[PDB]
Amino acid sequence: MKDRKILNEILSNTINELNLNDKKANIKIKIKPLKRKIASISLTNKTIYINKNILPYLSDEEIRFILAHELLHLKYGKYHINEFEEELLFLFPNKEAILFNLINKLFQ
Amino acid sequence: MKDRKILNEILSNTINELNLNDKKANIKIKIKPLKRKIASISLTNKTIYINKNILPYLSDEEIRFILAHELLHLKYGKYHINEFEEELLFLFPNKEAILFNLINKLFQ
Ligand SMILES: [Zn+2]
Numbered sequence: 001m002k003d004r005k006i007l008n009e010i011l012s013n014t015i016n017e018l019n020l021n022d023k024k025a026n027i028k029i030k031i032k033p034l035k036r037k038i039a040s041i042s043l044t045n046k047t048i049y050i051n052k053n054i055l056p057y058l059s060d061e062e063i064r065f066i067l068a069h070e071l072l073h074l075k076y077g078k079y080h081i082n083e084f085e086e087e088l089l090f091l092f093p094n095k096e097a098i099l100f101n102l103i104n105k106l107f108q
Numbered sequence: 109m110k111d112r113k114i115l116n117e118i119l120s121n122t123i124n125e126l127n128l129n130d131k132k133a134n135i136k137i138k139i140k141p142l143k144r145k146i147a148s149i150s151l152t153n154k155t156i157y158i159n160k161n162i163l164p165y166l167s168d169e170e171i172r173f174i175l176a177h178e179l180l181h182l183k184y185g186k187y188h189i190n191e192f193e194e195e196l197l198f199l200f201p202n203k204e205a206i207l208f209n210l211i212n213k214l215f216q
C-alpha cells in the first residue's frame with residue numbers, strides 16, 4: 001500500500017494553508033479504483049477519492065498537487081474560477097509545467 | 109484514419125488568429141506514434157506531430173487546444189513565457205479544466 005504518513009501530512013498541511021480547518025473533522029482521503037478519473041470528491045461527505053491504480057505512478061509533488069486540486073474543488077465548487085486558480089498557483093508556482101508533464105506521464 | 113477536414117480547419121484558423129500566416133507554407137500536421145507525448149514539434153521543420161494512438165480519444169475541443177498549444181511553442185519557443193500563457197488562456201479560457209480532464213481521460 002501507499003505510505004499513509006506522507007498522505008496524512010499533505011492532507012493536514014494543505015487543509016491548513018487553504019483555511020479549510022473548519023472541515024478537518026469531515027475531510028478524509030479514500031483510495032479505491034476509479035473508472036474514468038485520477039481523483040474525485042464526494043461533496044456531500046467531503047471525501048477525496050484517489051484512484052488506487054494511479055497512486056503508485058505519482059511523484060510526491062504530484063500527490064501534493066492533486067490533493068490541493070481536489071481540496072480547491074471542495075472549497076470553491078465545480079469550476080476553476082480566478083480565486084481557485086490563484087490559490088492553486090500560490091501552492092504550486094510551477095503548476096502549468098506540472099500539468100503538461102502529468103498528461104504525458106500517465107497516458108495508457 | 110482521423111478526419112482530416114477538422115484538422116485542416118483548426119490548423120488554418122489557429123495559425124491565422126496567432127498571426128503565424130507567414131509560416132503557413134511551412135507548418136504541417138503529421139500523425140505518428142509518440143513514445144511519451146500527446147503531441148510535439150520539430151521547430152526546424154515547423155512540423156506538429158500528433159500521437160497516432162491518442163488522437164481517436166480526443167474531443168474536438170481537446171484537438172483545438174493541443175494544436176494551439178503546439179503552435180504557441182512554434183511561435184514563442186520551448187517555454188511558457190507570460191505572452192505564451194496569456195495567448196493560450198485567451199484561446200481557451202477553460203484551459204485548466206481541459207488539462208485536468210485530459211489527465212482523467214488518457215490514464216483510463
Ligand atoms: Zn508547452
Ligand SMILES: [Zn+2]
Nearest residue numbers: 073080205208
Ligand atoms: Zn479541477
